[model samples]
Target: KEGICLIDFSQIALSTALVNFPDKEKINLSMVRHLILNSIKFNVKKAKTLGYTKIVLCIDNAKSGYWRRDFAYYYKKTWDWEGYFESSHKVIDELKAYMPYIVMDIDKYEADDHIAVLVKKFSLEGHKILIISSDGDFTQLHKYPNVKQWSPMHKKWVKIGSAEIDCMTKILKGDKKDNVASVKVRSDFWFTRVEGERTPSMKTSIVEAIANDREQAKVLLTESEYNRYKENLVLIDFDYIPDNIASNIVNYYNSYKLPPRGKIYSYFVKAGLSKLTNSINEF
Candidate 1:
């Protein structure tokens, strides 16, 4: 209950306190608290059906930017990092005392990377994992039979096996400009490749075309440096990402007991769809 909200509540309180003047304005702490309580209620309802009696929710505080790429990009300082982490560890130790089994996942590299690793590690060890996140980077990690992606965008559970490659391909292509690194700026390049008029080395041609044409140059300006020059350099780097995650995951599994494979399929299917169904409406 406290897990889904802490930061949001903290923000509201801080914001109102900053704006409120002595004997001048009312605070909206009650409304903020209510919103958090309601979200906790929804989480509890879902956890109940998933066979969770005592659930442990872990939130990152000192390094909260893991979820917000824009913030991570902007916050260049780790000014009070030690203090923040010490506070977080105390909170976690308190939770561990209450609930012996906790599924804690973190990645200093990237949140998506850490989450992907945990999903794969537990999957092979006989635990099914359901990941909920707005990020598309986690789509590729759904390699195991037990893994499923809960699309916070689509409000649906997508199986990772077959969809993983296609999703990664789309993400790698870079049409998703809002994402970390969307695509190459060359409209001609992506279109040419789609039409089979270009080869993988067309990256050079795309760069040249962007240089010569005004419209292409404008498009190129919209992209980041990593998308244009370095995109070709990473023809297969995404493949190596899983191994990095695996190393950290190994440490986690060794340090803690993995959650047993619960009645995940039943909870998933009872939402109204079968395993064999092509597109489980509720999967």
Candidate 2:
């Protein structure tokens, strides 16, 4: 046992199962359940292999709705968004039987933001953090020395550069995937001519890029564009988490008990996942 492993199960479930799965038509509660349960076991094994002492599995609080509900509503309109939400809640319910496995049901904040807060909390207490999430946003938390982000699908640690630069890149490029609006600059902007696109090159830091043409970067972006970029920084930045929420997470984590292995095994058996049942029992 080393430190803490915070698994972002919300992103893992939705991205791995719902968004990327090919057979969208055949998507059902059973499939979601199986995938999530397997995901838990996999992440737990991976965390232990990497030498973590505790694992905190993170999820969205379905009762309160996600912070990006409107955004998800608009962008994921074609998909069965409501059905996916329902299935995620169902998975969380089943996962409850596997407790003693710490779960942070994010209530008033986005799962990513809550994760940022949790990482900050544990890192401050001098615990090494292995974050399990496909979302690159967690890469920013790598600003802290004890924090590292791992991709469950890729099965490798993410290499992150400066978090400051990452935030600036997101502001400049805008996250189209998450529907954050980008900062628009003049056509003749020097950076535009050099980089040749609205998106950041990702090869260079924003600081370096701006240094190349600070005067031009200043002149090119309109007042509105500058303001939009500033707003987007707030939108994308993870620096402003509330203390109460973070404290509550720490308290819950301290008070929680790991569920009995027999209960976890029962869920897997009823689901007809014989392999996972054996794995659960072994753990």
Candidate 3:
């Protein structure tokens, strides 16, 4: 699509699977593989026509178990960082001989968390940062300038222009059944059996609570239902991405405007300066 950029896969882990359906790991992997294959197949023409400078795939070394861990408690560990570096490097090595190059890099944070940080950094540097991810949490990063959403299934690129707390409100209302949190049905005392069975005023995910207005948080005091989910989700912070990698992404933003010299660069440069540098460098 026109405005979005896709990040790479997150760490593979069995523990990261849905808490209730531990046996669905195979199904989850299939979903991920389907997403990757469809994205590559459907977006290549759009990518080439739009003259993307390069495709960057960002990875993190954290295990799937870490998704459930408290990010604030165990972040930036040496093993996690090194794992990202090696994993991304391994992916890059496989694509070395390809044209119009694709590169890989590691983010010391969760993949979506890294994308949020990079998007903010890129926006500050006056570069566009359209994020393509299935996770809705990245919607917070949608506040930055020039960010947008690319939905592979929806088959369209959507400009991210609004900030509404409704997204969070819906989630807090217990809309996502897949989550491990125990949703409360309303009490008959409040209203009819159906209406009364709604979740009690408490037991909301902090991230979900923050999703609407931040001030609404003050009114929320109850904390029944799994607090660990809320606690762990608070680890979705934006301070983990490094600065140099951010600049490189901004450089890529600028390079998109440079004309192709032959395949990747405009031939006019090669027609005049072929004797100086090879056509490959023009890319």
Candidate 4:
């Protein structure tokens, strides 16, 4: 079986292609597509070198809005935000036509959850899975021996100790960029607190602290605050899909196959991506 890659297209689109661009003012579809195309080309070559032949690119769909809106930062409000989305959608449409392997999590699923579900499904079937993303959250998938998270930006495997523990770390520390405030802690110690100004302290690992606190109710926050942490955990853990939609997704992927390079050539040519078009066969 060829190595299967699940790409979180939204993560790459927002982080690397849009935010990291050299010029902020020229953040149009052409520039965005230019960067993403280069990423896909580079990663495709990288995956090929590593013995992978199949690529699965996933883009967010409508279902993402409800959960996504919970965090204020999710809204990247700009004067041309509507135009930005229009261009983004256009790019995805062109890419889908050019690369039939690309998939969107339309009405049925979210891009992140879809990627996670596919990763698990394929890995269970005994296929090597590589996740092409820049998001650190995907690192939790490293627990699967057959699954690897490849950070295209860093060009290396994301360092992860244990998936279970990594999830706990995120819950306790929180991620500001995503608008997840850290669990409040007592100023004097590393123990969590229900009501107090947020403070930072280093001690035992979050896993250990949580376990000890649960046993003694000392290191962890009060029951009220602990519940809040649990809520945050739900937001961070996007590795599964609803059971109802599982079977159909499995069937969809089972029947999916990549189209020929000629199918993708015109799109790249129109985008003025000569470098990618010249070596399109490798894709």
Please identify model 4 stretches exceeding 4 Å from their true place: 19-21, 61-64, 68-85, 107-110, 181-206, 209-221, 238-261, 269-276
Error of 4 at 212 (Å): 9.6
Better of 2 and 3 by lDDT: 2
- Which sections of candidate 3 miss by over 4 Å? 1-4, 8-44, 60-64, 71-93, 96-108, 159-167, 170-213, 223-283
lDDT of 4 by residue, 1-283 (tens): 6688888876676666455655435467886677667667777788767866678877767644533344332321133445456677777777766775656455535567667778877778788988888767777667666888788776788766365656666666665445554555322122333465455642346455663353432435666557546655655665423455566566666666656657777877777877777777666
Cα distance off (Å), candidate 1, residue 168: 3.8
Off by over 4 Å in 2: 18-25, 61-85, 185-223, 242-258, 270-274, 281-283
**Candidate 3: global Cα-lDDT?**
0.42
The residue-level lDDT of candidate 4 at 22 comes to 54
lDDT of each: 0.40, 0.66, 0.42, 0.64
Error of 4 at 176 (Å): 2.9
Per-residue lDDT tens digits for candidate 2, residues 36-124, read 77677677888888777587777766455544443233211156666667776877866766644767775745567557887887788
RMSD of each: 14.4, 6.2, 11.9, 5.6
Tell me the tens digit of each residue's lDDT in model 1 across 1-283: 1111001112222233343323333323333332333333444445345543333343333355432332223221213334333443543443344323354546444433445555555556666555554345555666555555544324566544334334434433543232323244442343233544433322544445543442554455445534443342232234445444457645764586533334334432442324323321221
The segments of candidate 1 whose C-alpha lies over 4 angstroms from its true place after superposition are: 1-41, 51-109, 134-137, 151-156, 159-165, 175-179, 182-239, 242-245, 256-283
TM-score of 1: 0.43
Question: Considering TM-score, which of the candidate structures 2 and 3 is the better prediction for this target?
Answer: 2
What is the Cα-based TM-score of model 2?
0.73
Q: Write the per-residue lDDT of candidate 3 for residues 65-84, one digit (tens) a residue.
A: 34324333232221233333
